[PDB]
Amino acid sequence: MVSLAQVRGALCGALLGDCMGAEFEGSDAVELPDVLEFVRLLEKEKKAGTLFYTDDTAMTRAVIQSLIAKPDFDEVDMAKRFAEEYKKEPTRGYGAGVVQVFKKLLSPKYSDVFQPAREQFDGKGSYGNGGAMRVASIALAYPNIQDVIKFARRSAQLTHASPLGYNGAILQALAVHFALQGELKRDTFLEQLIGEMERIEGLPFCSRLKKIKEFLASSNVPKADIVDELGHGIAALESVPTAIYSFLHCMESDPDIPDLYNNLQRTIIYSISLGGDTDTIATMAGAIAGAYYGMDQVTPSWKRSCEAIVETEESAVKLYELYCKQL
Numbered sequence: 235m236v237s238l239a240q241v242r243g244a245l246c247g248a249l250l251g252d253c254m255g256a257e258f259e260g261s262d263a264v265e266l267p268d269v270l271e272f273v274r275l276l277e278k279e280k281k282a283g284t285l286f287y288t289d290d291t292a293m294t295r296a297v298i299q300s301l302i303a304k305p306d307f308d309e310v311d312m313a314k315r316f317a318e319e320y321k322k323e324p325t326r327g328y329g330a331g332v333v334q335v336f337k338k339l340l341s342p343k344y345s346d347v348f349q350p351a352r353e354q355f356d357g358k359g360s361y362g363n364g365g366a367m368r369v370a371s372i373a374l375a376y377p378n379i380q381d382v383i384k385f386a387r388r389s390a391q392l393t394h395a396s397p398l399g400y401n402g403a404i405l406q407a408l409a410v411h412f413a414l415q416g417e418l419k420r421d422t423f424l425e426q427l428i429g430e431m432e433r434i435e436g437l438p439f440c441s442r443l444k445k446i447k448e449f450l451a452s453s454n455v456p457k458a459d460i461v462d463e464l465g466h467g468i469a470a471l472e473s474v475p476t477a478i479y480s481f482l483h484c485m486e487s488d489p490d491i492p493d494l495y496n497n498l499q500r501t502i503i504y505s506i507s508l509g510g511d512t513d514t515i516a517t518m519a520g521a522i523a524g525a526y527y528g529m530d531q532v533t534p535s536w537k538r539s540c541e542a543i544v545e546t547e548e549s550a551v552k553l554y555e556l557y558c559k560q561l
């Protein structure tokens with residue numbers, strides 16, 4: 235079964251990904267030398283908590299507080315927490331679309347908490363990665379895969395009504411789910427994901443998962459190819475597969491990252507190096523890596539730099555107890 239180290243690892247990895255990623259958000263300019271330089275500077279900063287979190291963590295904290303409060307999953311409670319969190323701290327770096335959902339949820343006009351999301355972008359719904367960026371904790375709370383799928387979907391559908399948005403969230407939740415389940419081989423991990431997403435989609439996400447397989451069978455794949463084929467975007471389709479690739483790639487040495495950085499550190503460094511939506515791709519790859527390698531790879535020097543590290547650790551313990559209760 236899942237250990238405390240794994241739940242702690244997942245959440246801290248997600249926080250690190252968000253906080254460190256934020257440095258480089260929306261940049262066509264990022265290459266690995268800058269990330270390594272940034273990390274060296276980070277690891278000798280005298281003050282703790284210099285890196286502030288973004289919408290990624292803010293929404294993550296709301297998910298977690300909903301699961302703890304309503305462990306059978308209460309989407310009305312979760313929507314309320316998203317909307318109140320936004321209201322309290324609107325400048326955290328939210329999507330331009332999703333702001334309209336929060337205001338609609340805060341008004342007394344909607345009895346149906348899914349309806350604001352359905353109305354997004356001319357009724358097509360958002361295909362953004364905001365559903366996925368906050369979903370890891372679903373997989374940390376619910377052992378059963380069928381729960382992980384349905385609750386990933388519903389948590390996502392509060393903001394992301396498009397199949398790309400909510401299926402992106404399911405994929406990210408499944409990636410954490412399967413990373414939790416033993417030191418599972420690379421090839422087993424992927425088989426599991428492709429299997430599930432083929433059933434769920436039918437295939438955009440499956441297509442990208444197959445590309446990941448291809449890339450992982452080659453060596454020294456340029457980052458240009460990864461960005462071209464997988465993306466580094468705010469779209470779920472162009473970020474969730476990318477996060478998964480970053481996790482899988484960094485299970486082995488990358489010749490450009492010193493091997494004195496552990497696998498989780500490597501994963502975060504590599505993720506950020508891909509550019510674009512650096513906070514979300516790194517928060518997602520970091521959640522998966524955290525679940526896989528556990529808290530042993532979340533180094534004191536790194537975690538101390540993050541806003542809300544203590545609260546995050548505390549919430550990991552609470553999530554672990556929820557998980558244990560569900561067995």
Ligand SMILES: Nc1ncnc2c1ncn2[C@@H]1O[C@H](COP(=O)(O)OP(=O)(O)OC[C@@H]2C[C@@H](O)CN2)[C@@H](O)[C@H]1O
Nearest residue numbers: 289327328329330331332355359360361362363364468
């Ligand atoms: N269906 C769509 N049609 C046109 N544009 C879309 C559509 N769906 C999403 N987008 C674009 O994607 C952006 C983000 O989607 P939203 O639902 O607003 O927000 P969300 O996915 O939470 O944003 C995640 C980002 C990740 C970082 O940029 C900060 N937060 C929108 O403001 C649009 O620009």
Ligand SMILES: [Mg+2]
Nearest residue numbers: 288289290513
């Ligand atoms: Mg962000």
